[PDB]
Write a protein that binds this ligand. Structure first.
Ligand SMILES: Nc1ncnc2c1ncn2[C@@H]1O[C@H](COP(=O)(O)OP(=O)(O)OC[C@H]2NC[C@H](O)[C@@H]2O)[C@@H](O)[C@H]1O
Ligand SMILES: [Cl-]
Ligand SMILES: [Cl-]
Length: 141
């Protein structure tokens, strides 16, 4: 399985894992799991400065690993398309490969406030990450 599921706190995953979640170009991160990424890691200024757009990924390097901000939409209030999620995931994959990331932890990205369906997102993750050695762990409370 590409994806392993864990019930609990995403933020208690291994300190060596890289992390991922979805935000907008606005980097407001005011709700959902995002507000917890904001509290824990900050970095809003640095993220804004990367000037990443829908379908891209912004990245913070912290403690030797990476925190991926999947930029899946323009405004905080928008809802993403599957196409832009997929492009952001592909951007993360490319960065992972180039930088030797092998272990990612994430929530059920796109499938809370952003209204996507995990039956689709899971399959998308499997298709995007096939033929890599990148192990994904998905957390839920
Ligand atoms: N506080 C908290 N703890 C743990 N898991 C949570 C929490 N809040 C939401 N979730 C879960 O995280 C999953 C993803 O939902 P959400 O956090 O709403 O992320 P989306 O990717 O759907 O939406 C992203 C958008 N919301 C704020 C961002 O900046 C984006 O604008 C999902 O299963 C939610 O139930
Ligand atoms: Cl946002
Ligand atoms: Cl900063």
């Amino acid at each position: 399985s590409r994806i392993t599921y864990v019930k609990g706190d995403l933020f208690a995953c291994p300190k060596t894992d890289s992390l991922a979640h979805c935000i907008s170009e606005d980097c407001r991160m005011g709700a959902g799991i995002a507000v917890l990424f904001k509290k824990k890691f900050g970095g809003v200024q640095e993220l804004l400065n990367q000037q990443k757009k829908s379908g891209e990924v912004a990245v913070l390097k912290r403690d030797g690993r990476y925190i991926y901000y999947l930029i899946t939409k323009k405004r905080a209030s928008h809802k993403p398309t599957y196409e832009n999620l997929q492009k952001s995931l592909e951007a993360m994959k490319s960065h992972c490969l180039k930088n030797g990331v092998t272990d990612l932890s994430m929530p059920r990205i796109g499938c809370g406030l952003d209204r996507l369906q995990w039956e689709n997102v899971s399959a998308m993750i499997e298709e995007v990450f096939e033929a890599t050695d990148i192990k994904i762990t998905v957390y839920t409370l």
